[PDB]
Amino acid sequence: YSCRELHFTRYVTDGPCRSAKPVTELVCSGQCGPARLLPNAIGRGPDFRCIPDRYRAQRVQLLCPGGEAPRARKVRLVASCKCKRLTRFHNQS
Amino acid sequence: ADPLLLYANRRDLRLVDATNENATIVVGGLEDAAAVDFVFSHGLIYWSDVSEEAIKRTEFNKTESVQNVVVSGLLSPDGLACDWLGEKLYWTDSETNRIEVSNLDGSLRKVLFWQELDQPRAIALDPSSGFMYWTDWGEVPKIERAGMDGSSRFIIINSEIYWPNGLTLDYEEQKLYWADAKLNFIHKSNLDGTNRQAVVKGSLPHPFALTLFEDILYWTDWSTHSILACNKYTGEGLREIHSDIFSPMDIHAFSQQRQPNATNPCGIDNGGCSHLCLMSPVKPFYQCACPTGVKLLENGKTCKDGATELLLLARRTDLRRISLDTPDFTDIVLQLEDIRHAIAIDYDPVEGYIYWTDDEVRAIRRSFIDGSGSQFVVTAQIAHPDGIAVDWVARNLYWTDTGTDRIEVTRLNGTMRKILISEDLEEPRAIVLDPMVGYMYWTDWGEIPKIERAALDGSDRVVLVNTSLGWPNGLALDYDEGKIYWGDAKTDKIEVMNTDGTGRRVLVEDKIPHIFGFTLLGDYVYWTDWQRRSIERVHKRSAEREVIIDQLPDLMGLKATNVHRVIGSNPCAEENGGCSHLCLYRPQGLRCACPIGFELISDMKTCIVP
Ligand SMILES: *[C@@H]1O[C@H](CO[C@@H]2O[C@@H](C)[C@@H](O)[C@@H](O)[C@@H]2O)[C@@H](O[C@@H]2O[C@@H](C)[C@@H](O)[C@@H](O)[C@@H]2O)[C@H](O)[C@H]1NC(C)=O
Ligand SMILES: *[C@@H]1O[C@H](CO)[C@@H](O[C@@H]2O[C@H](CO)[C@@H](O)[C@H](O)[C@H]2NC(C)=O)[C@H](O)[C@H]1NC(C)=O
Numbered sequence: 271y272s273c274r275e276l277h278f279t280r281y282v283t284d285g286p287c288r289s290a291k292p293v294t295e296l297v298c299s300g301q302c303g304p305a306r307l308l309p310n311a312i313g314r315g316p317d318f319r320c321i322p323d324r325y326r327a328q329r330v331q332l333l334c335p336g337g338e339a340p341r342a343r344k345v346r347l348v349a350s351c352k353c354k355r356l357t358r359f360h361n362q363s
Numbered sequence: 364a365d366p367l368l369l370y371a372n373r374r375d376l377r378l379v380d381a382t383n384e385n386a387t388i389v390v391g392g393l394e395d396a397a398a399v400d401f402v403f404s405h406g407l408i409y410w411s412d413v414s415e416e417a418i419k420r421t422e423f424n425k426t427e428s429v430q431n432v433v434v435s436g437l438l439s440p441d442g443l444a445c446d447w448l449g450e451k452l453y454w455t456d457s458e459t460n461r462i463e464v465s466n467l468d469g470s471l472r473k474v475l476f477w478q479e480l481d482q483p484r485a486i487a488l489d490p491s492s493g494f495m496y497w498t499d500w501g502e503v504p505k506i507e508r509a510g511m512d513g514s515s516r517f518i519i520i521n522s523e524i525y526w527p528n529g530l531t532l533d534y535e536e537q538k539l540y541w542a543d544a545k546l547n548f549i550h551k552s553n554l555d556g557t558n559r560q561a562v563v564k565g566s567l568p569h570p571f572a573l574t575l576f577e578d579i580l581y582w583t584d585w586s587t588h589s590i591l592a593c594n595k596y597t598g599e600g601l602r603e604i605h606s607d608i609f610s611p612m613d614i615h616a617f618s619q620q621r622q623p624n625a626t627n628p629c630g631i632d633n634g635g636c637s638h639l640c641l642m643s644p645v646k647p648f649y650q651c652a653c654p655t656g657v658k659l660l661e662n663g664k665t666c667k668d669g670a671t672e673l674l675l676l677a678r679r680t681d682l683r684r685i686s687l688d689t690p691d692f693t694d695i696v697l698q699l700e701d702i703r704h705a706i707a708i709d710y711d712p713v714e715g716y717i718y719w720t721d722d723e724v725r726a727i728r729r730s731f732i733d734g735s736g737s738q739f740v741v742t743a744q745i746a747h748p749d750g751i752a753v754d755w756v757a758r759n760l761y762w763t764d765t766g767t768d769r770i771e772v773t774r775l776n777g778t779m780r781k782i783l784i785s786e787d788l789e790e791p792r793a794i795v796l797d798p799m800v801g802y803m804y805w806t807d808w809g810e811i812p813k814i815e816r817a818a819l820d821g822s823d824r825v826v827l828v829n830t831s832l833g834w835p836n837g838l839a840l841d842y843d844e845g846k847i848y849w850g851d852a853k854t855d856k857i858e859v860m861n862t863d864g865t866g867r868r869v870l871v872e873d874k875i876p877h878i879f880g881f882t883l884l885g886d887y888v889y890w891t892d893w894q895r896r897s898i899e900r901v902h903k904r905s906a907e908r909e910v911i912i913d914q915l916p917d918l919m920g921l922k923a924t925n926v927h928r929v930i931g932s933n934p935c936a937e938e939n940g941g942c943s944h945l946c947l948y949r950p951q952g953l954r955c956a957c958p959i960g961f962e963l964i965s966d967m968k969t970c971i972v973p
C-alpha cells in the first residue's frame with residue numbers, strides 16, 4: 271500500500287447525545303515505505319509514516335433523548351494523508 | 364604472468380589473471396567491499412565497506428593475513444586511493460560530502476574538502492606531481508583536480524558529462540581516462556582537461572571502475588557482471604576477460620609498475636612537519652598539515668597542542684566534538700562504547716575529562732576528549748540526569764535528577780555524595796555554576812516554571828525568574844559580563860538577563876522551535892534545536908547567526924569550552940579549604956560538609972562516623 275485515504279462513515283457522540291446525520295471520517299492507512307536506491311547509487315535513517323496532513327472541520331447538529339432541543343456542535347476531522355515526521359512532546363524517554 | 368587485476372566483489376577481494384581464468388581470493392568474509400587500492404612497496408591492500416562503514420587494510424604477503432581496522436565513523440565511503448609516496452590515504456564519502464586524508468595507520472584524519480561535493484565517487488592520485496583527481500555525478504556532474512595538500516582545487520571537466528563513474532591515469536603518457544555510465548563512452552585527456560578526445564564511443568552498459576596497464580584498458584561493468592577490456596589508444600577490441608562476477612566494484616592493475624618509485628620531498632625528517640607531510644604541487648612540493656579542527660602555527664610546520672576552543676556535543680547514541688578553530692566544523696565521532704541515551708554533558712579543562720549522563724544506563728560517566736579512560740562515576744540511585752555541571756575550582760560534580768526530583772553533589776570521581784536540593788522541585792533539568800561568587804543556577808519545567816538560584820550548599824534558595832517562563836531547558840553564564848543567558852522551548856524564544864535582575868531582553872524570537880542544548884563561550888551562544896535537528900550560533904553583542912551543522916538526528920545537549928585554559932579561584936582550592944570531604948563555597952565563606960553516615964565535628968572541617 272502507498273499511504274492512501276480510507277473512508278468510513280460514523281456517528282459522532284457526546285455520550286447520550288448523537289448526531290442527526292453521520293460523517294465520513296478518513297483514516298491514514300497505507301505503507302509509506304522508504305525510497306528505493308538512486309539509479310547509480312551504491313547499495314547496502316528517517317521515519318516517514320503515513321500521517322494526517324491537513325484537517326477539515328464540519329458543523330453537525332447533536333440530538334439528545336426526548337425532552338431537549340437539538341444542540342449544535344462543531345467537530346474537526348482528517349482531510350489528507352502525507353508522510354511527515356513527529357516533534358511535539360518534550361521529554362527524555 | 365601479465366597484469367593481475369585486483370577487484371572488490373562486495374563480499375571478498377579477488378585477483379584475476381589477464382592472460383587466461385582462475386581468480387584467487389585475497390580477503391573473504393566482507394559484507395560490502397566497495398573501493399580498493401594498494402601500496403605495493405609496503406605490500407598492503409586497502410579497501411572500503413559501505414555496510415560496515417569503515418576502511419580496512421591487510422598485508423597480502425603475510426598468510427592468514429588478519430585485517431586491520433583503519434577507520435570508523437564514516438557513512439558511505441564510495442571511493443578510495445592510496446598515496447604510495449607520501450604514505451598517505453585519501454577517500455571520499457557520497458553522503459557526508461567530504462574528502463578526508465590520513466596516514467596508513469588511520470591516524471591524523473584531516474578533512475581536505477567539504478564544499479560543493481554532492482555525490483563524489485572515484486579518486487586517483489599522482490604523487491610525483493602532487494595532484495589528486497576525483498569525480499562527482501550528483502547535481503552538477505564534474506571531474507575536479509586539486510593538490511594533495513588541499514590547495515589549488517579547480518574543476519577540470521564540466522561539459523558533456525553525467526555519470527563519471529570510473530577514473531584512472533596513464534603515468535607513462537601523462538593522460539587521464541574516465542568513463543561515463545549514462546553518456547556511454549570512455550574519453551581521455553591531458554592532466555588538465557585539454558585535448559579531450561574519444562576512445563570508446565559506444566557499447567557501455569553501466570561501467571563503474573576503470574584501470575589501465577600497458578596499452579590495454581580494463582574496467583568493471585554492473586549490468587553485465589563482468590570485466591571488459593579494450594585497447595588504450597583505439598576503441599578497437601571490446602572484450603570480455605572475466606565474466607559471471609557476483610557484484611564487481613573497484614579494480615586496479617596490480618603490479619609495482621603502476622606505482623613508480625620517485626623521490627619524496629618530505630625526506631627522512633617528514634619534511635620537518637609535526638604531524639602530516641602531504642604532497643603538494645607548489646614548491647617545495649610538500650605542505651605540513653594538522654588533523655581535523657587543529658590549526659597550524661606560524662612555523663607552517665608545527666601543529667598546535669590540540670584544538671583551543673572546542674564544542675563538545677551529546678547525541679543519543681554517540682558523543683561528538685566539534686572544533687571551533689576551523690571553518691570546517693567537522694563533528695568527530697568520539698570513539699566510545701555503550702552509550703544508549705546520552706543527555707547532559709560538561710567538561711573539565713584541568714584534567715581534560717568529559718562528564719556526561721545517560722537515563723537508560725542510569726549512570727554519570729567520564730572520558731577524555733579522545734574517548735579513552737571511559738569510567739563510571741555514579742552508578743546507582745540515578746533516574747533521569749537532565750543536567751550536569753562541573754565545579755572546576757572545588758573539584759566537585761553537580762547534577763539534577765528529575766526521577767528523584769533532587770540535586771546532589773560529589774567529588775569529580777564519584778566519592779562523597781550529598782543531597783543538596785530535595786524539596787519544592789518539579790521536573791528540574793539544566794544547571795550551571797559560578798564558583799567565584801558561590802551561586803548555583805538551575806531551571807525546572809512548565810507547571811511552576813522558574814530559574815531558581817542558591818549557594819553551593821543548598822542555602823538561601825532565591826527564585827530568580829518567575830514571569831513568562833515555559834520550557835526553560837538550557838542555561839549558561841557569561842562571567843566576564845555578569846549576565847546569564849537562558850532559553851525556552853515552549854515560548855519558542857530565547858532571552859538574556861543580568862545577575863542583578865537588571866535587564867531582561869529577548870535575543871532571538873524568530874525560528875527557535877525547540878532548544879534543548881545550550882551553552883555560551885566568548886561572544887557566541889550555541890544551541891541544539893529539536894524538530895530541526897540543527898545547531899547554530901548567535902553573536903552576543905550582535906544577533907547574527909551561523910548554521911554550523913544542520914540535519915543531525917537525535918540531538919541532545921552541548922557545552923562549549925576551552926582546552927587547558929581555566930579561570931576563577933576561591934578559598935576552596937587551597938588544600939580543599941581544609942575540609943576533610945566537601946568544600947561548598949558561598950559568599951559567607953566556605954562550608955565544609957560531610958556525606959551521609961558521617962557528621963560534622965566541632966571544628967566544622969573534618970568528618971567522622973558517630
Ligand atoms: C609478496 O607478494 C608479491 C605479489 O604476490 C601476489 O599477490 C599474492 C596475494 C599472491 O596471490 C601471489 O601469488 C601474487 O603473485 C610477490 O611478487 C611476485 O614476485 C615474483 C615471484 C613474480 O611472480 C612477480 O610477478 C610477483 O609480483 C612477492 O614475491 C611476495 N613476497 C615474497 C617475499 O615472496
Ligand atoms: C578520588 O578517589 C581517590 C581514591 O579512589 C580518593 O583520593 C584520596 O582518597 C583518600 C581516602 O578517602 C583521602 O584521604 C585523600 O585525601 C584523597 N586524595 C585527595 C588528593 O584528596 C578520593 O576519594 C577521590 N578524590 C581525590 C581528590 O582524590
Ligand SMILES: *[C@@H]1O[C@H](CO)[C@@H](O)[C@H](O)[C@H]1NC(C)=O
Pocket residue numbers: 826827828829
Ligand atoms: C513567583 O510568584 C509569586 C506569586 O505568584 C510572586 O510573589 C513572586 O514574586 C514570584 N517570583 C519572583 C522571583 O518574583
Ligand SMILES: [Mg+2]
Pocket residue numbers: 399400443444445485486487
Ligand atoms: Mg582509486
Ligand SMILES: [Mg+2]
Pocket residue numbers: 457458459460480481482
Ligand atoms: Mg550528498
